[PDB]
């Protein structure tokens, strides 16, 4: 979970550790164009706990 890039159920796991027991919510539910803003930041790049950080909460 470090310069490692999360995508689908990964960014989940990882977003659990970050919000840990604060809770958070996954980005829209359409799958086909959701948040780009959490997956694709951490899928498409390398995120540091910090941005998910973000959404958690």
Do not use: K, M
């Amino acid at each position: 979970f470090v310069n490692q890039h999360l995508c689908g159920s990964d960014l989940v796991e990882a977003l659990y550790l970050v919000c840990g027991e604060r809770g958070f919510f996954y980005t829209d539910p359409t799958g086909g164009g959701p948040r780009r803003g959490i997956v694709e930041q951490c899928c498409h790049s390398i995120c540091s706990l910090y941005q998910l950080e973000n959404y958690c909460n």
